Amino acid sequence: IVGGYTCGANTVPYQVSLNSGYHFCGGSLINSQWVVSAAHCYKSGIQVRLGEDNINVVEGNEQFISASKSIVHPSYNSNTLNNDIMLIKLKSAASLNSRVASISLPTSCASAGTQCLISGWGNTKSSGTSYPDVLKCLKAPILSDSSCKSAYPGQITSNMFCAGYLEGGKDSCQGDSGGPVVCSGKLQGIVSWGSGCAQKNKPGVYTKVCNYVSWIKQTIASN
Ligand SMILES: [Ca+2]
């Protein structure tokens, strides 16, 4: 997160870290046994870390659970990042408490102008490199589809939306991938892509979660 703020320990209790020997992507806990992330975050050997604040210090509220299965969306296109969504099933159920909690899936899609909360442990610089130890947060609005399409002509599908600031300075970044965009108490987006981070006229592009709720519910009910 570029231009964000320190969230505060466990104030984003649905945020997870995906770890393959090192933090590499974010995700969101949607019930005791399932996490949603980005399909471009796929790898083998995922451990899901819940209840994290400082990802480099064991502070006492963590739960570390290995993934039993990953399921990339059937229509994921790694070239265009269309359908950039994946489900991760935990080998055992997390214990839900005040520091580890699930986020609701949307019943209705979110609207332009809504302010959302984006969070993660990704890069905090626009062209330099600095990765934080503690979770960072960003408030950012959903942009109109016409502005999104103007920023990235020929690149935006109906499964994507833009959020952020056309003037630049505030955005998600590498390492935040897979993490949440929460609007009005619902998981509406997944950190997906962008040209650089926090560049002028290049806002963040997010997987539109409300298009996937049927697939998520059916997949959970079957695995
Ligand atoms: Ca920790």
Count of Cβ atoms closer than 10 Å to residue 57 Cβ: 11
Q: Are 70 and 42 in contact (CB under 8 A)?
A: yes
**51 and 91 both lie in a single domain:** yes
Q: Which two structure tokens, joined as six digits, stand for 65?
A: 């659970």
User: Residue 56 corresponds to which tokens in the numbers above?
Assistant: 């480099």
Tally the residues of the chain: 223
Same domain (yes/no): 92, 45 = yes
Pick the catalytic residue: 17, 23, 28, 40? 40
Ligand 1 center to 36 CA (angstroms):
20
Range of the domain at 194: 1-12+103-210
In this structure, what CATH number is given to the domain that contains residue 215? 2.40.10.10
Resolution in A: 1.5
Q: Is 172 labeled as ligand-binding?
A: yes
DSSP for 135-167, please give it: -EEEEEEBPPHHHHHHHSTTT--TTEEEES-TT
Are residues 7 and 17 both part of a single domain? Answer: no
Residues 189 and 221 grouped into a single domain:
no
Same domain, 108 and 1: yes
Give residue for tokens 């408030």: 139
The gap from C-alpha 162 to its chain's centroid, in whole angstroms, comes to 14
Cα separation, 171 vs 158, whole angstroms: 21
* Cα–Cα distance, 138 to 118 (Å, whole number): 5
Q: How far apart are CA 181 and CA 119, in angstroms?
A: 7
